[PDB]
Amino acid sequence: GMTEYKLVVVGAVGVGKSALTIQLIQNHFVSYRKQVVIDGETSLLDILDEEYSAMRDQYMRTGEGFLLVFAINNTKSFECIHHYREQIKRVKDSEDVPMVLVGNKSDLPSRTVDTKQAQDLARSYGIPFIETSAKTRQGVDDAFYTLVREIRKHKE
Ligand SMILES: Nc1nc2c(ncn2[C@@H]2O[C@H](COP(=O)(O)OP(=O)(O)O)[C@@H](O)[C@H]2O)c(=O)[nH]1
Ligand SMILES: *CCC(=O)N1CCN(C(=O)CNc2ccc(Br)cc2C)CC1
């Protein structure tokens, strides 16, 4: 009776992909599944489980929506976003794939990527940007819920 969405969290190593997922589900900071209610509608999210790692194309292809995560104190991680977005476009064979740009570790003061640079990038890609902290939970439900909204809009 309930929609199920396969979400992929992608980004450079140590940007907080795992921590974001654990925060979402367990509300704690040290596939995975969670049911959420968004706009009145219950959905089951299935979040599929070194500088950076390249992910299997077949794995990427199973995602219905993607969080593109970088860490706001890691400029190299922000550089990687382009490559992950290009991989998603390639494997999904579409310029229009549900995605959100996520700038993580917003609780840290050592910032090297300005909110405005990321805002401008996300505008160029035509996607929402959300600053998050896996540590404080700031932004976390917003990132995932916004992604589900993107998926639902795309399906309509
Ligand atoms: N301060 C802070 N540290 C974070 C945040 N998210 C992740 N970390 C830390 O960053 C490191 C890498 O996080 P991890 O989830 O393993 O990154 P992944 O490789 O992208 O899955 C760990 O030491 C985490 O505790 C966050 O929002 N704030
Ligand atoms: C900073 C992030 C970055 O430079 N990249 C580029 C490499 N990459 C890929 O995902 C592309 N490589 C890839 C993927 C699947 C298969 Br099958 C084979 C290959 C070579 C990670 C992001």
Residue 53: which CATH number? Answer: 3.40.50.300
What distance in angstroms lies between residue 30's CA and the mean position of ligand 2's atoms? 29
Method used for this model?
X-ray
CA 24, CA 20: separation in Å to the nearest integer? 6
- What contacts 79, CB < 8 A, 6 or more positions away? none
| Structural resolution in Å | 1.5
Residue 126's domain spans which residues?
Answer: 3-154
Determine if ligand 1 sits within 6 Å of the CB of residue 52: no
List, chain by chain if needed, residues with CB within 6 Å of any ligand 2 atom: 12, 52, 54-57, 79-80, 83-84, 87
Determine if ligand 1 sits within 6 Å of the CB of residue 135: yes
Domain count, the chain: 1
CA 84, CA 69: separation in Å to the nearest integer? 10
> What end-to-end distance do the CA atoms of the chain give, in Å?
18
CA 102, CA 104: separation in Å to the nearest integer? 6
